[PDB]
Design a protein around this ligand. Structure first.
Ligand SMILES: *[C@@H]1O[C@H](CO)[C@@H](O[C@@H]2O[C@H](CO)[C@@H](O[C@@H]3O[C@H](CO)[C@@H](O)[C@H](O)[C@@H]3O)[C@H](O)[C@H]2NC(C)=O)[C@H](O)[C@H]1NC(C)=O
Ligand SMILES: [Yb+3]
Ligand SMILES: [Yb+3]
Ligand SMILES: [Yb+3]
Ligand SMILES: [Yb+3]
Lengths: 278, 155, 166
């Protein structure tokens, strides 16, 4: 008598010579649990039972480590002939199939995919500047751009702040001509050398810068002149403007100068214009 | 520039020419200007940043609640946006923007960084959020040239 | 009486399905487990935050009395289930609470139509990648998933169903 505990069915090879006494046994008076399957075996004398693990009255039990399937193999022979005499005893065999119930089932590799972002964008823009004429108090526009000889042409230069850091504007160069072309002769560079207002030095005029009403603002006054032989009074003033933060120092290039009996400029920082003596 | 039309943020002005729209990292279609794929940064004469970000810049498409600027504040959050993009609009003096000087340029710099969360357990650390970083500058040009005209006559 | 006895095998396997939609508006939870990956599909590239469906099944059984319950389920970088780093997925069947991308069990079997539905145990979570514990930058080392299981038979009399703090 032997057993094989397959995954889904049980195979039970019982012996015909169950008692081992050279006797017939089994006039179909035997069952495995409640089912009595018998596969004819006329050569090995082994009656082959088969039964699903949960069938034929199997008892499923459990332990910390194992499951169990129990089958009751029963043999209850009927009396043979017209008498109650039974030749052999009943038989019972405990059949247990244990199964490990705890398993660490794993999986194959999964490749994690993502895409980080890193870049360095950039964009550019221009500041806002204006050069304009002013009335005699530097507060309002003077659209009457016509003046007489010797009159003081009041002029404002401004850079517009908006939401920028506080700025300071400078006049780098200013040339006067009789045509819009800055290189057209005649020309007169009345502001040069990084803001040196040379007119006050050259003509002795009262041409001079005016203290900044605002850092983004700059003011000055120019004495009117013409050119010898010029029939028209038109003068085409062309300038160049710079602007930086007010945190930037007053230096040899970012200055605004005028020769007022010497050099005293940008509202007090006089020595900065020391290099206008050239 | 295959942006679906229901989420197209416009650039420039309706009269903007195709060349002007392409010169500012925006795409044209013959009748409109809208921001293209990726991300874009633009600057304006009034002194503000324009930051346009698409949700596809990173994988996974970052849940927009997690991103913050270099500095924080009320005016430092997202502005009007849509399902695919987000726009940040703020002065260049705001939200931790750094300012720098160059002899001929005024530079503003700001960097967006998303805080991608790291999850921690007793035996290790993981994450499910992709990192984000966007450095950008605005560079305003000085050295503007201006001209006016007068007339002078004898007294 | 005699007490003949022998050993008996029991096999379980864990596989990955696919949350596809054969029609617009399909149920992703039920559609997830309509097909699974073969070994040739691996390494299966998966995006971060993506859903990951997991099916555990008892193989080759005709016993309807077995209910597959799950203990600890976790993930590591290597096939060694005891390697580091690790991240928990399930605890005693209940989800690992210290994870805002929470895991969840999916015991849809009233409509799965599969035979012996209690032999299967299914759950999903969101894909991740491991992070270096000192650089805070995510690594590119493959993710491996592992579980621990138990055969929880009602005949024995047990409440292995996850009693969880929801
Ligand atoms: C199947 O997976 C389980 C995990 O659920 C494995 O059990 C784990 O076994 C390790 C030892 O290999 C245990 O680690 C130990 O932890 C204690 C503290 O709990 C520590 O003092 C020891 O030095 C050691 O590090 C781990 O705790 C344990 N986990 C659980 C939940 O019990 C099991 O080994 C795996 N393999 C099987 C079951 O064949
Ligand atoms: Yb044990
Ligand atoms: Yb036993
Ligand atoms: Yb969200
Ligand atoms: Yb909007």
């Amino acid at each position: 008598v032997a057993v094989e505990c397959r995954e889904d069915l049980a195979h039970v090879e019982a012996k015909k010579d169950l008692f081992g006494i050279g006797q017939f046994i089994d006039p179909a008076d035997l069952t495995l649990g409640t089912c009595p399957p018998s596969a004819e075996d006329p050569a090995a004398q082994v009656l082959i039972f088969e039964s699903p693990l949960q069938n034929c009255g199997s008892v499923l039990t459990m332990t910390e480590d194992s499951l169990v399937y129990t089958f009751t193999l029963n043999y209850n022979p009927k009396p043979l002939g017209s008498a109650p005499v039974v030749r052999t005893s009943q038989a019972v065999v405990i059949v247990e199939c244990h199964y490990p119930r705890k398993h660490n089932v794993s999986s194959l590799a999964l490749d994690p995919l993502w895409v980080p972002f890193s870049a360095a964008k950039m964009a550019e823009e221009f500041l806002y500047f204006t050069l304009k004429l002013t009335t005699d108090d530097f507060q309002f526009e003077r659209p009457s751009y016509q003046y007489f000889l010797g009159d003081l042409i009041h002029i404002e230069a401004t850079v517009k702040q908006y939401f920028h850091v506080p700025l300071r504007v400078y006049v780098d160069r200013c040339v006067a001509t009789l045509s819009p072309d800055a290189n057209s002769s005649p020309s007169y560079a009345f502001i040069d050398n990084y803001g040196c207002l040379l007119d006050g030095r050259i003509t002795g005029s009262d041409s001079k810068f005016v203290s900044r009403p605002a850092e983004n603002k700059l003011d000055f006054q120019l004495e009117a002149f013409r050119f010898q032989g010029a029939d028209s009074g038109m003068i085409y003033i062309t300038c160049h403007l710079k602007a930086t933060s007010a945190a930037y120092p007053l230096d040899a290039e970012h200055r605004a100068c005028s020769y007022i009996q010497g050099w005293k400029e940008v509202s007090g920082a006089d020595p900065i214009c020391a290099s206008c003596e050239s | 520039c295959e942006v679906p039309r229901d989420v197209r943020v416009p650039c420039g002005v309706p009269d903007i020419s195709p060349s002007a729209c392409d010169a500012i990292d925006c795409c044209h279609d013959g009748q409109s200007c809208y921001f293209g794929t990726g991300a874009t940064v633009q600057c304006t004469k009034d002194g503000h940043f324009i930051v346009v970000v698409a949700k596809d810049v990173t994988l996974p498409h970052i849940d927009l609640e997690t991103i913050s600027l270099l500095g924080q504040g009320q005016d430092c959050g997202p502005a009007d946006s849509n399902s695919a993009f987000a726009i940040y609009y703020f002065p260049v003096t705001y939200c931790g923007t750094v300012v720098m000087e160059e002899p001929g340029v005024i530079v503003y710099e700001n960097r967006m960084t998303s805080s991608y969360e790291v999850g921690v357990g007793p035996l290790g650390a993981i994450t499910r959020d992709s990192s984000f970083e966007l450095l950008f500058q605005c560079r305003y040009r000085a050295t503007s040239v201006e001209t006016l005209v007068v007339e002078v006559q004898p007294p | 009486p005699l007490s003949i006895a022998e050993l008996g095998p029991l096999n379980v396997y864990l596989q990955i399905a696919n949350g596809q939609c054969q029609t617009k508006g399909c149920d992703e939870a039920a559609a997830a487990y309509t097909s699974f990956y073969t070994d040739a599909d691996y390494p299966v590239t998966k995006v971060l935050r993506d859903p990951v469906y997991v099916d555990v099944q008892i193989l080759g059984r005709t016993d309807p009395n077995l209910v597959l319950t799950l203990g600890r389920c976790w993930a590591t970088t290597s096939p060694n289930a005891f390697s580091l780093p690790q991240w928990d997925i399930l605890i005693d069947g209940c989800p690992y609470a210290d994870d805002r991308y929470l895991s969840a069990l999916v015991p849809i079997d009233h409509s799965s139509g599969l035979p012996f539905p209690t032999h299967h145990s299914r759950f999903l979570f969101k894909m991740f990648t491991f992070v270096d514990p000192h650089s805070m930058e995510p690594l590119r080392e493959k993710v491996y998933i592992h579980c621990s299981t138990a055969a929880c038979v009602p005949g024995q009399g047990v409440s292995c169903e996850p009693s969880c703090s929801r």
